[PDB]
Amino acid sequence: KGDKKVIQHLNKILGNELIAINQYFLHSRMWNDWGLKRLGAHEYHESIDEMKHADKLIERILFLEGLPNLQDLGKLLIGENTQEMLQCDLNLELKATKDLREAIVHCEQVHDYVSRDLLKDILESEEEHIDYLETQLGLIQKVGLENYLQSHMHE
Amino acid sequence: KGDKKVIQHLNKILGNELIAINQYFLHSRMWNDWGLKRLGAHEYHESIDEMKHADKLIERILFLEGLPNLQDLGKLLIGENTQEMLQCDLNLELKATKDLREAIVHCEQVHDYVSRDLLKDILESEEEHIDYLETQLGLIQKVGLENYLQSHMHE
Amino acid sequence: GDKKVIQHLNKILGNELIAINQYFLHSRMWNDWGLKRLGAHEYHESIDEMKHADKLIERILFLEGLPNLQDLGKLLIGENTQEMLQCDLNLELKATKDLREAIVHCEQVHDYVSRDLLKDILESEEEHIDYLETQLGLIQKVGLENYLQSHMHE
Amino acid sequence: KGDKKVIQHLNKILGNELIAINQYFLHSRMWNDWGLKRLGAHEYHESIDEMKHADKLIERILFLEGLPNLQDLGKLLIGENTQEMLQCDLNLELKATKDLREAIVHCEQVHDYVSRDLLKDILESEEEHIDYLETQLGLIQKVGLENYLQSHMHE
Amino acid sequence: KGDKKVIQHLNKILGNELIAINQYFLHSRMWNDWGLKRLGAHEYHESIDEMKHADKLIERILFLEGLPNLQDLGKLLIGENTQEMLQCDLNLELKATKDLREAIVHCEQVHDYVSRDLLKDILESEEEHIDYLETQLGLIQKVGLENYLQSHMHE
Amino acid sequence: GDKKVIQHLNKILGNELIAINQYFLHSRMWNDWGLKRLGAHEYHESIDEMKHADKLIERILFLEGLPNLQDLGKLLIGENTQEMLQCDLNLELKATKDLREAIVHCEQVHDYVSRDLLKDILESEEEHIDYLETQLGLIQKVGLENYLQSHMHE
Amino acid sequence: KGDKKVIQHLNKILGNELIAINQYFLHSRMWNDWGLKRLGAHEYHESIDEMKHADKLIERILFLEGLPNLQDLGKLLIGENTQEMLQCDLNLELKATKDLREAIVHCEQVHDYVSRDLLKDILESEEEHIDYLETQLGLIQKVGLENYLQSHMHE
Numbered sequence A, B, D, E, G: 001k002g003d004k005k006v007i008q009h010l011n012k013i014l015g016n017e018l019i020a021i022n023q024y025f026l027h028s029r030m031w032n033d034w035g036l037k038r039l040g041a042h043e044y045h046e047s048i049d050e051m052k053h054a055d056k057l058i059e060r061i062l063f064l065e066g067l068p069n070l071q072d073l074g075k076l077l078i079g080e081n082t083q084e085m086l087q088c089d090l091n092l093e094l095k096a097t098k099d100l101r102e103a104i105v106h107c108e109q110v111h112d113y114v115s116r117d118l119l120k121d122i123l124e125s126e127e128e129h130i131d132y133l134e135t136q137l138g139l140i141q142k143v144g145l146e147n148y149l150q151s152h153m154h155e
Numbered sequence C, F: 001g002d003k004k005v006i007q008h009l010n011k012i013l014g015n016e017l018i019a020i021n022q023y024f025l026h027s028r029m030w031n032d033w034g035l036k037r038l039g040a041h042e043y044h045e046s047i048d049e050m051k052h053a054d055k056l057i058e059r060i061l062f063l064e065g066l067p068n069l070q071d072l073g074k075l076l077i078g079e080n081t082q083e084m085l086q087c088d089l090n091l092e093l094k095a096t097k098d099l100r101e102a103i104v105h106c107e108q109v110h111d112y113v114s115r116d117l118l119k120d121i122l123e124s125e126e127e128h129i130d131y132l133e134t135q136l137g138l139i140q141k142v143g144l145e146n147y148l149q150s151h152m153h154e
């Protein structure tokens, strides 16, 4: 039996994963639909990463005797072109990261160091997502948008 | 976009790494030159470890949007014989480790748990290095210097 | 070892030290920017100079000198790809100039084994210079954006 | 032995092979030098094709008890940028093809059907070179000079 | 950008390579045509050697920002029988080797050590060519002409 | 072939021939004492010099001179391992000095291929010198008995 | 402690091995230099065999507590053409064989049966050398000098 405020945080984090999963899945398919297959494939793997984050959160919530909340789906940020799509993912990650850090503070406070550890490993992974996303946005500026999309057409 | 003092702490640690890379590479080659090829190889391994520490710090700094400092090289503690060389390496590692604990404190205070994780990984490895060095100096007292060196002539 | 040979060899060593750190930082800068093929090529240049330094350090010790790894000259760090290449080029041209003077001096005291070491390093520095001048040249011919594009993925 | 006029024709064709060898090898090496390595390698291949054409003409001429002329080297057409280099190669090929068709007419007239066959193989291969070259000058127009060159940087 | 006088020397060494390629290639095929195929294969290999020296010289000239001269072809020294053919190659190598020594001296004088090194490699191979050729001429004296040729009929 | 270059090559060859016998005797002296690792290493030095000799012999003949395997100068034979190592070191320092002078002469008459050969030999002699000095330094640092002990078994 | 006179016999045999090693090495390289490579390969094998005999004599002498003499080198018999070379080698082997028989008597006389055995093996090998050398001299008479040298040009 875990602490109630930590379980609530785990659920908040899980809520954030549920959004990211659907948002990235849809963006991946949007990119695939437009023949930008490489963007589509990379986004798809981002989506699978969030699905695994979720899975670990769900196991942890149950082990601590909480109820995993898969019912509440927050606001998807869907873009209409590849540059908005990248910025929408990036805004979602920055929000996920704020929430991860407050959850980690809470775990530390009540000595739930195993939850803390799970949260730190997700955070490292969201920081990599941010890195990738900011880099793509930078590349579009350095190589020009048309060139960037050309380079992400074929796998 | 990370904290200014965290970046500065990472640059400090990076500075300690750069020192260790040069001191250890030089010690390693001095040992090879003397035909103490086992001590040379091991010291070469330590040098490569510190090169890999530097790499990871540089990448973290760049990602947090700081400027990695590879320009400032502190004082190399260069020994004149194997007992001095080991003790000089031990002195540098004890100093790197003190700096690493202070950097970790700050990362925790400002919620940069990914930087902290990197620093902890680096601290764990510096503590192995200290173990290696204290062990050697102890072996010199237990088996005698001439035996110690003889046992480290041939790889 | 002629004391002046050792001094030339420590001077080359000091150039190697600057190139190592300059190229390693430039490599990581390009990786950070997502230009991984430039990043990887530059990392490979950094490694070559680490190897030159190693051989310089072995030869100096053999001739009974003290390798200087304490003094680190000025890094030329660029802030965009063209400037980073030009910095790399400017460092190589300086390095190549010292190597030549060191080779003259080795010949004059008959340290022919030091001459051969340094001529091997020089050959590798001319290769580096060729790579650098070629990338500049290619930026002019294909355009900066296309050049960067073709160095994004490995 | 061979008809004297046929041997002269075979030598004129060899003469054209020797220009092309040298012109194509210099251009290959110019392209490599500029880091256009895909162009370089393809032009090197074209050079080698012509070395093999020379080799067969030399063998045939000696078999017909004629004297192969490798002393007279005509005018190399060297360009100073890639569009000029391709146009120079194409001008040379159109010249070579015209000489080939006239050597073949003459072989037919004097019943030297084996030399005709060798000449026809060479002609088929020059026709492939012409196609390669016209196609490249065409792609320059369709994809733009810069994009064309970009796509022939790396092998 | 290399030394004007160095580039002019490299072009003179190139001129010598271009003469040797054609001369040895013709000699090779004359020997093949006569059924002396071992002599023919060996001379072909010498030909290939020279082509490879040419390629090296061309790359270096282009790297020193010079203009390689494949336009001028000096005088082929062509023999009528195996003894004259070997002697003509030998005459040509000795001239080549004299030019090599002069160019090396010049590279040394202006500190182009990488060009000197290229030219020394070529020189070592030309001295191997001279050794080969002198040895054959000696063997023709020791074993008699007819025996020499008989031993070079089949590969 | 230039006559003074040929006489310089024959002089290098005379040094190689001394080195071969001295090193081979030293090797078998060490094997006979049961210091087999020293013996094996000395044997490998001996073979190196046999290969140096072979190479000089071919060059001398190509240049149309007469190789001299008739004159065999003074072997430096030690009586214990320190002294045997020091004799070899004194022979290498002599050899190296003659090498430098021959190389000077080859350069002055433009025999660059002979110079290349001599410079490869020299590089190898300087490696032999580094092995030798290094073993002598190791006797001082680990003790003569320890050093011998670590060179008993292969 | 070996018998002083056996050790002096052993050193005389070793003296002969050292002359043979140098004489055959040089004749081998003279054959290679002349392009007579099969003669040269075989002579080289002979020189190697004498190097092995010298090796075994050295070990024996040192085991018997004697001083091996590698300082004194007797007269090389060097020839100027292939017939002289072989006859020179033959004169050196007959001289070696006479000294070997005398050492074997001495060994037997003082009961050093292991030395006699080492020398017996050496003798059998010198007799094989003699067979090879007289056989080649015979062959020159039967097939002619020029045919003989022709058959020994290529390996």
Ligand code: HEM
Pocket (backbone or CB within 6 Å): B018, B021, B022, B025, B048, B051, B052, B054, B055, C017, C020, C021, C024, C047, C050, C051, C053, C054, C069
């Ligand atoms: C005196 C300065 C240095 C010397 C002498 C030196 C020498 C070397 C050598 C010999 C190697 C292995 C080369 C090989 O693959 O054969 C190496 C590897 C490496 N170095 Fe350095 N180095 C120096 C400085 C640095 C610095 C400043 C960095 C900065 C991060 C660095 C990062 C690396 C990395 C990432 C590797 C590859 C390690 C691996 O094997 O995974 N080195 N260094």
Ligand code: HEM
Pocket (backbone or CB within 6 Å): D018, D021, D022, D025, D048, D051, D052, D054, D055, D070, E018, E021, E022, E025, E048, E051, E052, E054, E055
């Ligand atoms: C008469 C003029 C020439 C003739 C007849 C000729 C003939 C040949 C032939 C038959 C080959 C082998 C082709 C194969 O792969 O089957 C060859 C290869 C080659 N040629 Fe030429 N060649 C000539 C001139 C040149 C010139 C002027 C160059 C200047 C660089 C050159 C450079 C080369 C090179 C680099 C190769 C590849 C050799 C190797 O790597 O094995 N050739 N040549």
Ligand code: HEM
Pocket (backbone or CB within 6 Å): F017, F020, F021, F024, F047, F050, F051, F053, F054, G018, G021, G022, G025, G048, G051, G052, G054, G055, G070
């Ligand atoms: C005391 C005089 C010498 C002794 C005792 C000696 C002994 C030996 C031995 C034991 C070997 C290894 C043979 C085997 O079993 O394969 C060898 C190889 C060889 N020797 Fe000598 N040798 C002597 C002098 C010479 C001389 C004067 C030369 C002239 C160059 C020479 C040239 C060679 C060469 C080229 C090899 C083959 C090395 C290799 O590539 O492995 N040796 N010698």
Ligand SMILES: [Fe+2]
Pocket (backbone or CB within 6 Å): A017, A020, A049, A050, A053, A054, A122, A126
């Ligand atoms: Fe996630």
Ligand SMILES: [Fe+2]
Pocket (backbone or CB within 6 Å): A005, A009, A102, A103, A106
């Ligand atoms: Fe909380």
Ligand SMILES: [Fe+2]
Pocket (backbone or CB within 6 Å): A020, A050, A093, A096, A125, A126, A129
């Ligand atoms: Fe994420």
Ligand SMILES: [Fe+2]
Pocket (backbone or CB within 6 Å): A152, C153
């Ligand atoms: Fe990408």
Ligand SMILES: [Fe+2]
Pocket (backbone or CB within 6 Å): A154
């Ligand atoms: Fe497509």
Ligand SMILES: [Fe+2]
Pocket (backbone or CB within 6 Å): B017, B020, B049, B050, B053, B122, B126
């Ligand atoms: Fe470290």
Ligand SMILES: [Fe+2]
Pocket (backbone or CB within 6 Å): B005, B009, B102, B103, B106
């Ligand atoms: Fe702090």
Ligand SMILES: [Fe+2]
Pocket (backbone or CB within 6 Å): B020, B050, B093, B096, B125, B126, B129
């Ligand atoms: Fe450390």
Ligand SMILES: [Fe+2]
Pocket (backbone or CB within 6 Å): C016, C019, C048, C049, C052, C121, C125
């Ligand atoms: Fe370098």
Ligand SMILES: [Fe+2]
Pocket (backbone or CB within 6 Å): C004, C008, C101, C102, C105
């Ligand atoms: Fe100087």
Ligand SMILES: [Fe+2]
Pocket (backbone or CB within 6 Å): C019, C049, C092, C124, C125, C128
């Ligand atoms: Fe460089």
Ligand SMILES: [Fe+2]
Pocket (backbone or CB within 6 Å): D017, D020, D049, D050, D053, D122, D126
């Ligand atoms: Fe053709």
Ligand SMILES: [Fe+2]
Pocket (backbone or CB within 6 Å): D005, D009, D102, D103, D106
């Ligand atoms: Fe006609």
